[PDB]
Structures are given as C-alpha cells and as structure tokens.
C-alpha cells in the first residue's frame, strides 16, 4: 500500500541477527585511517629481534 506509514517502528527488535554474514566485504576501504593513533604502544616487545642484520 503506497500510503502506509514509512516510519520505523520503535518496538522493532534492536538486537543483531545471528544468521547474518559474518564474513568480510571485499569492496570495503582498504586504505589506512588518517586519524588512527600514531603513538607507540607501551606493551610492544622491547627485546631485540634475533634475525636483525648482524653485519656492520
């Protein structure tokens, strides 16, 4: 019916549907976010990498 109410029902279920596609979208922006945190993580590993170049 064209004249039926096009407004959202406030009492529609607001909870997520379990059987919705849990997989990723291929055509989603693969570029970086400019406003991500640019500072170092304190808990990153502070120990040397054994496979770093040992030559001068």
């Amino acid at each position, epitope marked *: 019916n064209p004249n039926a109410n096009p407004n959202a029902n406030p009492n529609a279920n607001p909870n997520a549907n379990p059987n*919705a596609n*849990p*997989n*990723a979208n291929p055509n989603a922006n693969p570029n970086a976010n400019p406003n991500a945190n640019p500072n170092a993580n304190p808990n990153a590993n502070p120990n040397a990498n054994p496979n770093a170049n040992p030559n001068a």
Partner: antibody
Amino acid sequence: QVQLVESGGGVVQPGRSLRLSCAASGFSFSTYGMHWVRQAPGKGLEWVALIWHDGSKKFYSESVRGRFTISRDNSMDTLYLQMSSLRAEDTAVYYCARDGADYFDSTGGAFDIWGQGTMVIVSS
Amino acid sequence: IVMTQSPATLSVSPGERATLSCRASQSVSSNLAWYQQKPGQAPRLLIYGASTRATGIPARFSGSGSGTEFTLTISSLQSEDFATYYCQQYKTWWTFGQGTKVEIK
C-alpha cells in the same frame, strides 16, 4: 592447503577452565567468520559459538552461554575458545569450522572447512 | 529451535542408489547443508544451499528440496560412500540432524 589445526585438549576435572586453540593456514583468516562445533561421544554434532570476521559480534549456544568465550587473533591466524565451569556434559570432540558463505550472501553459509578435532574429557 | 529429522538407518549394496531424507520443524529457505562423517574423522561438507555441491565432491551426490522437505540422493553407491550423513540448517540457528547411517547390505 586450506587447513584448521586444533590444540589444547586433554583431561580436566569438573569446575575448572580449559582453553582451546585453532590455527588456520592456506586462506585469508581475517576475512572469515569462525565457528566451534561439538560432538559428544556416541552422539551427533552440536554448534557451540560463532565469532565475526573482526571479532565484533559473538554468538553462543544456550548450553555454553555464560561459561564459554570465543575470541580470535587475526595477526597470528588463530582462534580461541575459553571454557570455564566445565561440566561432565562438555566432554566431546571440539571442531574448529569456517563459515562457508559467499562474501555477498547476506545470511551466512554452511561449515566449509573443519579441523582435525581436539578431545576434551571432563571427569574425576 | 528448528529441530531437524532424518531416517535412522538404510541398507544398500554397492552400486545401487541411496535416497536420504530430511525434514524440518519450520521452513528453512534453501539454507540446508549435508555432511559426511566416517568414524574417527571430522565431518566433511557435501551439499550446501540444499542443491549445490562442494568443491571436491563427485557428481553422484545430489541434493534437492526447499522449505521443509529435503532429500539427499547418492547414485551408484561406492565403497567410500558408506558412512554417516548429517543434515544441518543454518536459517534460524545452527542445528543438526541425528544422522542416517548407510551400511553395506
């Protein structure tokens, strides 16, 4: 070469906690939703938990909700299941499964790739 | 809970056709899967979408049906096809059937 390898099973007495692991290889792990499926000895299959491709949403069975927690680490291509308050009915083989949905299916698909399975025994 | 029925056991000699059945308490819109499990091994997907074969599945396996009634048909039952077959829906939740065991006649 699409594989799932479970680890972390064994024998645990009732009331304690045990953690399962599932390492993936041969595909892009960060783009798939992951499931846990359970098969008690001599019985059929039972679905346990689901995690989104990014870990945003988690869903659990009525039997394990509140006790079990599903999590993933996309950097290491590994999936986890933390089971606490373990009971005798949790003794089963725990399978790590991949959601076999097309990326534009809108509903989620079957269990495409299953792991080898890990046995969890809850007894005294 | 959408609870899934299946026949218990059917006996077929090698080379014949096997017709498996699957019924659902409610309607699942072509959101049904079929799995093959041999003792001591993990389940293996055969059919998804109630009609579509998985990647490395021989053409002798064929599924059909939609809504409530689903059938799994194996033509020219071979020696490797003797195992338990499971019926699963993924419409409302992820519930399996109790399985149907195919044994050598």
